[PDB]
Ligand binder design. Sequence first.
Ligand SMILES: CC(C)CCC[C@@H](C)[C@H]1CC[C@H]2[C@@H]3CC=C4C[C@@H](O)CC[C@]4(C)[C@H]3CC[C@]12C
Ligand SMILES: CC(C)CCC[C@@H](C)[C@H]1CC[C@H]2[C@@H]3CC=C4C[C@@H](O)CC[C@]4(C)[C@H]3CC[C@]12C
Ligand SMILES: CC(C)CCC[C@@H](C)[C@H]1CC[C@H]2[C@@H]3CC=C4C[C@@H](O)CC[C@]4(C)[C@H]3CC[C@]12C
Ligand SMILES: CC(C)(C)CC(=O)Nc1c(F)cc(C(=O)Nc2nccs2)cc1F
Ligand SMILES: CCCCCCCC/C=C\CCCCCCCC(=O)O
Ligand code: NA
Length: 386
Amino acid sequence: APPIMGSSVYITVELAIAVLAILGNVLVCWAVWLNSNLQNVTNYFVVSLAAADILVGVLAIPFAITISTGFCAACHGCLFIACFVLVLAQSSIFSLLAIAIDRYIAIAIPLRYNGLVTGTRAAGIIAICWVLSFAIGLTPMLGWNNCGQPKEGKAHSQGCGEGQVACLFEDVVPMNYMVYFNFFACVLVPLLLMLGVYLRIFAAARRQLADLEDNWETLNDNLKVIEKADNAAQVKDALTKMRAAALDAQKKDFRHGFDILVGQIDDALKLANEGKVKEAQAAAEQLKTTRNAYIQKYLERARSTLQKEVHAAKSAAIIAGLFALCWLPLHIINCFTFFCPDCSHAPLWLMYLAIVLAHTNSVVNPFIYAYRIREFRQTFRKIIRS
Ligand SMILES: CC(C)CCC[C@@H](C)[C@H]1CC[C@H]2[C@@H]3CC=C4C[C@@H](O)CC[C@]4(C)[C@H]3CC[C@]12C
Ligand SMILES: CC(C)CCC[C@@H](C)[C@H]1CC[C@H]2[C@@H]3CC=C4C[C@@H](O)CC[C@]4(C)[C@H]3CC[C@]12C
Ligand SMILES: CC(C)CCC[C@@H](C)[C@H]1CC[C@H]2[C@@H]3CC=C4C[C@@H](O)CC[C@]4(C)[C@H]3CC[C@]12C
Ligand SMILES: CC(C)(C)CC(=O)Nc1c(F)cc(C(=O)Nc2nccs2)cc1F
Ligand SMILES: CCCCCCCC/C=C\CCCCCCCC(=O)O
Ligand code: NA
């Protein structure tokens, strides 16, 4: 069969992916521009993400079509178009790694997040990552290439001039760079780091919740210790454990709630040190009405805020998971080409399937924000309507 027929399916799919990559991610950046709520440090890395995704459809996908033809070109010119996609991939890894750290800081030290990260500090980090993304992605340009040993038989076959080579990815980019330098160090290592970061995120989130239910049980169980106590000392051991638990749960409406609770504990605590048993048991009963009007409000506002931060971390973890699933097949084919010389090279239909699968990651991101983030979903509607 003619080669152009099989190539017609590939180019059409490649362009279809490019259209969805530009439209979807432009819609994300326009939503962040309009909405005031969507303007925060976490979303700036989201825009830095969608920035690279647009550049895939505008440059990387057109580049990938041009390489598929094997057109004649100078080895370094062919080297830039083949390595530019490596810059955008490294940009996305740094962005995804920044989001995981951001969500880790917000859940580990909530009362220090606003003092730690700001807008201007985040904007600088984006610049540093993008500069490093060019450096890593264009390392073969600095001399780690196969230009010194060009395929001459393939060049004269298509009648390339002197200094020109048949432009193909595996022909100009060394596989050791792609396996050791690119895959292992630059791709696999940061991906494993995100897995560890997200593991600590979900660990620290649930541990604060046995903490929330533990203080709630320390407050409830010791009330029944006072209700059936015999002596003045037994009420003291129950009130002192509640007083420490009351001070542990807090760390205007929030402050005044404990002002009545901890105060009423001292009202009964002083009556216990005097020896008055019955008057202490009555003063402790006042704590129940204070519990149903202030404490249970904070038990359930804390549970609500922690659940919304876990929902945000789950949504961000999906973006990293979809990045790993989309790119790994294209990387493992590089591992087979490099490590196993006895193996027959992966067929052309599979190579086409792996490339488009790596490109699909540009489209999948805006669908996740709409399905998982409520603020993004509402903002998309008003841009579509008008
Ligand atoms: C953002 C866009 C519009 C800016 C332009 C970038 C593109 C289109 C330009 C800049 C560098 C150019 C490469 C310059 C070097 C060569 C070597 C030659 O044998 C074939 C063309 C080729 C490979 C050019 C491809 C087009 C190229 C990649
Ligand atoms: C998430 C991480 C750990 C993924 C691991 C990918 C790498 C390390 C593993 C999984 C599949 C492995 C390939 C399994 C098959 C072979 C065939 C053999 O002749 C050489 C090694 C080689 C080619 C392995 C390379 C390493 C490989 C690519
Ligand atoms: C991590 C998940 C997404 C797994 C994806 C499956 C990929 C990486 C595995 C499964 C089947 C594998 C193919 C197994 C058989 C061949 C033919 C051989 O001559 C070279 C390797 C090659 C082409 C393997 C490529 C990698 C391959 C496509
Ligand atoms: C289809 C050909 C063989 C006739 C031309 C060609 O070589 N196409 C091609 C391409 F445009 C990009 C890549 C690529 O990006 N590979 C990566 N592996 C890890 C990160 S990126 C691989 C390719 F084979
Ligand atoms: C912005 C969305 C995508 C539309 C942009 C147009 C994409 C054009 C596709 C490929 C451009 C290059 C085609 C191949 C050029 C080399 C041909 C040759 O020299 O034989
Ligand atoms: Na991407």
